């Protein structure tokens, strides 16, 4: 749930990663919607739509307002640890990743889109550096559907087993005013992905889910045109009659084939991130016969677990599994860097 | 020859707001409440009607009447636990959430037309059970209070009742065996009542059926008795 | 062949991991059963239909000579009031050659009866303090 | 046994001398359930409850728990609507990699007792 | 995430005195009886009726009607010892201020209101089993009687009923995924009744509905049906 | 023992539950059991 | 156990593959609907309109060497090139009945002489007599009259083969395309009798006074006194009962084995001897002795038991029903190789 | 869904034009909420029940009592005297060191389904 | 089971037994026990 949010925004601390709960928490720090700046909005579908945490990466001051740390930071700032991109690496709790702000600089010209292509092409370098978190990228304004499909396989590619993308613009609806704005759908995209984690679990994919918090789509998608998008690993969002507004597609912005489904990938960092906090018997103990035996216990009373909640194919929990840790997979040589398992988990999607 | 085949899933009550116009079908969904537990034992039950009286005035018995048809029955058993985790509410929280199924809701009040929300027991394929059903008696035992008073180990019992789903909104051919007055007894129950099949299809001699043509039935509107 | 590998009753090793229980001394009662259900064939007499019912696991009575290590027994099972931990354990049979001739590992576990020590001023033995345990399935 | 009458088809199309075609028999059951099975309950805002609710299923786990909301979903849509028809079961399967997920309806106009699965020929 | 989080509480049950003028709301507390055993067990039942004929003109099954929803119920058990100090009273003295909730009180009957004391079940953050209810029937079982007649060992058994609180005392935003004909259905349950929603907004042009607008939806009050 | 008794229509215009009214009080019950005994002394006539 | 077998001409399709159907639909994506007047088309269509969910089609001919030994009416055993002729069934192991359609619009149409075509229904015998499991349908000549069809039977023909069955009056069928009569065998229609019976009553009752749904009117009725010189002699019977539409009547395969006459208990066999042949595959495997040869008389006493438990056997007890021998006696010490034989029966038979 | 209507606002104040300003939406559901709370059930002796019968329980110890009436407090008023809330959870967590009571209490106006907190900004 | 009905009213103006009358006769009744398994092929529909 824990989603990430780096933007511009009028005050509060800079470059701090600071943790909001709520949306009037978010007032208190930096401010609500003045200047336009996206990040305010984003946030707020995101709080509109389930999801009780988020961190905020404020740079950029109301008004260097836009470059490539300033503004839409990236850098990796030398493992400054609250500089860019870095400061979430502190943090091993943050699972969603959004860069709404930055397209604001493309549409208000201060950046150049082999500019943004860097930017988002380091945050899934992040997101591959560490082994959890999922990126969403958002596309260009305006890209027309016959030219956002070259827009992907041409200008930025990224073939990344860690990014999602979602092709047309949210026209959102601001409370305070009540007129319609064009926002990228990161913030509010990352709002259901916050529902099924408290929801129907982690095993569903995040669609077929209202997009509560819209109004209007800009340049709406027939299905027709939507079947040569899907297969190449873009989602899409439609206007289906008397159903409101949802999310169609669940392809992660990769290109092998045995990890194209997002609820896999969001399956497997959630499965990672549970064991590994389980099996800390690291520093610890002494590599023998002995503790490779434990751990291929340890871990199958957990996936037989797994197995109760569904979400592993097998009818029986023989069939689900294949846990092998034993002496001759660890060689006499095992210079400290012995204690390897294997695993398994699957259930895609429709 | 199977779908998913070889996995487990979990029984889920589904709850429905209840219709309001002129609807059958049950509104759209309010909240749906995932089991802890599957059920151990369910069970189903059905009950006819046949008033029978014993006298005549020849004492012989008496041929009954179909009276009625009484709605299906089902008596659930919801078990929820989090003993491994005392001081935690979830279990009070998921009964306050299973007992809206026996107050009027609030939207139906608005419309004038009050009714408790509608209920579906969907499990995997088990189509036998899963109807659209309305909630008459819960009864809940609490056991294993944990400190602080929440308690923890809560069984509920469920009485369901199947709501019937109704108004969902006759050529024969002639074989070399069959006869008018055969077609007759067949459909009509009356052999003497021929005349009406040969008079809706003009059929003048009753003895030259072409074997293989098409006759029409008409219903019982010509005879009503 | 090599004369074979036969199996045997003295050498083993017993374990709980999770709390620091560490390694017990003696196992008992490890089985699993079936629950067959007999229905009787009204017009067939000769025999009743066997068929089966679901599968249940026997509890286990563990043993150990009662070392000071006996405080953390007491603490894991005065623990449901806060919170209980369900470790995985093991029980492994071997000859003596240290090899291994089978390996069973309980799924979960949870403490279920304690019968201290029998404490007697005429009897000659060592104070053996019995934990039984209770099962959620074995492990592959 | 049962009357099915007669309508024009799904595809319609001229005809052998002009106008417009017009079927009758087993074949107009076929086309019938092709159009209630096809459309979303909307986009005939008229008749809104008309139009199997299949879309509400997309994207669910590959499950039995899932196919056997659908095979429950076909069969109150499947009768509400076409009452010229008695169905016989319904089969959920993932028949192409473990990914999409078929149905395949046995139906059989009432007496005549014929059964016949609905194929969709495109 | 918790309050006291690490403490041990004892339920004890609140009486107040009954409400006098055009009041819901308990009056003030009266006594406040804190138990000497938290109950082992809490049962809670609940009940809907349901009147359903069988017959009809068809006798096909009927839909039933929704006559009315019964109370809510508890059955506590009430435990009392003072096993280790016979010859005292403090049981039956407890028992006594226990048996107020049968009888009508004074205050009330002299406002010509007589009704027998509320009492409120309140234990820790047990929101489900806390609500304004009467004590219904109080069997009380007496056991090991102390020298010279004091009674030591009581259970007593309750059994409570809750009493509603009732009389606590529209606007929709047009999606691009809607529209007027599936607005009536949404809130009316009838199709063709759109008309009623196009009037009170006074929009004339049923083709636009610009999207983004707020559109007021009447109560049924113009379809009084 | 001890009763009470509350009447309450569940029916209405609303369906809603509805407040009860206190009918009356039924009077306090008591169940004794009474033991005597003469066996120490047979043929005597005291517990007759 | 139901699985039907076809051999014809059909327009398009693939050619001298034994492809597979299940539904029509699935017929009629391959291989046309009824244009051109080939008989395989509509015998498909009655066996799928009167139950039987599965079916092999052997397309051979083609629209327009129209019809011959091999193309056409095919009888040629292909040289067992899996590929041709008959011999495409023979990887198979799972088909249970065949028939054969087409064999016989050419003699309607005169592309066959009658001497040829009676070869081509005794290769199909063969075939039957070969592979031990499945039963053939045969069909005779069209408008071949009742006092002389008796003549053709035992003069013509004269199979006499334990995997025939024959059913003499032809089949006035509808077509629901254009609602009009025409004549077929009942090859297809029977078979999909056969189809119904195992899936509604098992292989143990016989197939037969069940109605021949699909049916409209009978070419040269038959009356009963002209049936019982043609029943006793192994030709069965299709008649119009009054009021009861119409039925197969007779039950008598195409033998004159007196203790094999029934169709239901070489329905039975063929079924249980390939149910067991089935379960028993110890073969090539656990060491021929004194210990297999015990082993194999409890698996197949295990088996016939249980087969005693659904009926379809007599004895009122299970000691009587079987009787299994496969001890020493049996294997003597000179058969290294060709060994474990056993014995086993069953038995049920109908009116 | 619900209507939220127009009013005035607690801490009232001039305006941009002049008069007084009136404010609506979520952020006026939001001051009704204020109202509510602070008062105690007095101080407006027209309406005696309207108010919280908070301060009657200060001062009493910290237990999961004191917490648990706490509950059933809040949720009576909220529902008794501002009817177009619907009432998510009420949250009560110690807060320096086992020392006062903090009142969390999320909220959502009817039909919306938009989390949100009281937080009573001083 | 099978049952029969006899009225039979005590009182007279004698107060003898009185001879009862054969009112009618209740219809046939019977309770059978099905019994349906498949728990040899888990997974499989026979028994629903």
């Not at chain 1, 990890?259 to 103990?285: A, D, H, K, M, P």
């Not at chain 3, 563990?62 to 806060?82: E, F, G, H, M, N």
Request: glycine residues 10%; contains cysteine; hydrophobic residues 40%.
């Amino acid at each position: 749930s824990v989603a990430a949010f780096v933007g511009l925004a009028p005050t509060g601390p800079l470059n701090e990663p600071t943790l909001v709960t709520n949306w009037t928490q978010y007032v208190a720090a930096f401010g609500d919607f003045t200047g336009g700046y996206y990040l305010a909005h984003s946030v707020y579908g995101f709080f509109n739509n389930g999801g009780s945490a988020a961190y905020v990466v404020r740079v950029g001051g109301s008004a260097q307002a836009e470059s490539a740390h300033p503004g839409p930071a990236q850098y990796l700032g030398d493992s400054s640890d609250r500089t860019g991109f870095g400061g979430l690496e502190a943090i091993d709790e943050i699972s969603m990743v959004a860069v709404p702000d930055l397209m604001a600089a493309y549409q208000r010209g201060a950046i150049d889109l082999e500019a943004v292509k860097a930017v988002q092409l380091g945050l899934i370098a992040h997101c591959e550096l560490m082994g959890d978190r999922v990126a969403i990228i958002d596309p260009p304004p305006n890209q027309n559907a016959r030219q956002i499909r070259v827009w992907r396989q041409e200008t930025a590619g990224y073939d990344s087993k860690y990014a999602a993308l979602y092709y047309p613009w949210i026209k959102s609806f601001d409370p305070a005013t009540g007129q319609s704005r064009l926002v990228p759908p990161s913030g509010h995209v990352a709002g259901i992905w916050a529902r099924n984690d408290s929801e129907r679990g982690v095993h569903k994919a995040p669609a077929n889910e209202v997009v509560r918090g819209a109004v209007d789509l800009e340049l709406q998608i027939t299905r027709g045109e939507q079947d040569l998008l899907n297969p190449i690993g873009v989602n899409c969002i439609r206007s289906f009659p008397g159903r409101g507004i949802r999310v169609w597609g669940a392809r992660t912005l990769s290109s092998d084939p045995a990890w194209r489904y997002l609820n896999i990938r969001r399956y497997f960092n959630y499965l990672e991130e549970s064991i590994l906090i389980g099996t800390q018997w690291v520093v610890f103990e002494p590599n023998d016969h002995n503790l490779w035996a434990r751990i291929r216990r340890n871990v199958s009373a957990f996936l037989v677990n797994e197995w109760r909640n569904g979400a592993l194919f097998g009818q029986s929990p023989d069939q689900a599994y294949y846990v092998k840790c034993d002496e001759e997979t660890n060689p006499p040589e095992s210079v400290d860097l012995g204690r390897v398992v294997c695993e398994i988990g699957i259930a895609p999607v429709k | 020859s199977k779908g998913a085949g070889k996995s487990l899933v979990r029984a889920n009550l589904a709850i429905h707001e209840p219709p309001t116009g002129k609807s059958t079908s049950p509104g759209g969904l309010i909240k749906r409440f995932p089991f802890e537990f599957n059920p151990a034992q369910l069970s189903i039950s059905q009950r006819s009607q046949w008033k029978a009286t014993p006298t005549a005035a020849v004492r012989k018995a008496a041929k009954p009447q179909f009276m009625g048809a009484e709605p299906r029955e089902m008596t659930l058993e919801i078990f929820l636990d989090s003993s491994m985790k005392p001081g935690g509410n979830t279990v009070m929280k998921k009964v306050e959430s299973l007992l809206i199924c026996c107050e009027v809701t609030a939207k139906s009040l608005a419309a004038k037309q009050p009714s408790p929300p509608w209920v579906i027991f969907e499990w995997g394929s088990f189509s036998t059970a899963r109807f659209n059903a309305y909630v008459a008696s819960i009864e809940t035992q609490y056991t294993l209070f944990g400190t602080a008073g929440v308690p923890i180990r809560a069984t509920c019992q469920m009485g369901l009742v199947e709501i019937p789903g109704p108004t969902p909104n006759r050529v024969h051919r002639v074989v070399a065996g069959d006869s008018l007055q055969s077609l007759a007894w067949s459909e009509y129950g009356s052999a003497n009542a021929w005349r009406v099949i040969a008079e809706a299809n003009g059929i003048d001699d009753p003895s030259h059926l072409p074997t293989g043509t098409e006759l029409i039935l008409p219903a019982t509107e010509e005879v009503p008795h | 062949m090599t004369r074979k590998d036969p199996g045997s009753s003295i050498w083993f090793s017993l374990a709980i991991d999770g709390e620091s229980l560490g390694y017990f001394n003696g196992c008992e009662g490890l089985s699993t059963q079936v629950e067959v259900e007999q229905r009787q064939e009204g017009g067939n007499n000769g025999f009743v239909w066997q068929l089966p019912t679901r599968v249940t696991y026997s509890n286990i009575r563990l043993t150990r000579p009662l070392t000071p290590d006996t405080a953390k027994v007491a603490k894991w099972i005065s623990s449901v009031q806060t919170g209980i931990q369900r470790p995985t354990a093991q029980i492994s049979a071997l000859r003596a050659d240290g090899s291994l001739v089978a390996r069973w590992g309980l799924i979960d576990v949870l403490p279920v009866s304690w019968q201290g020590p029998s404490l007697d001023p005429g009897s000659a033995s060592v104070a053996n303090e019995v934990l039984e345990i209770a099962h959620h399935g074995f492990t592959d | 046994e049962q009357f099915v009458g007669s309508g024009w088809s799904f595809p319609l199309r001229i005809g052998p001398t002009g106008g417009i075609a017009l079927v009758s028999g087993e074949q107009e059951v076929e086309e019938a359930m092709r159009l209630i099975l096809a459309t979303a309950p909307g986009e005939r805002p008229m008749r809104p409850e008309f139009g199997c609710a299949i879309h509400d299923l997309v994207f669910a786990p590959v499950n039995e728990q899932t196919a056997g909301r659908i095979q429950h979903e076909v069969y109150v849509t499947l009768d509400r609507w076409e009452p010229r028809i008695e169905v016989h079961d319904v089969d959920v399967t993932t028949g192409e990699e473990q990914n999409v997920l078929f149905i395949d309806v046995r139906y059989s106009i009432r007496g005549t007792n014929n059964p016949r699965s609905l194929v969709f020929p495109f």
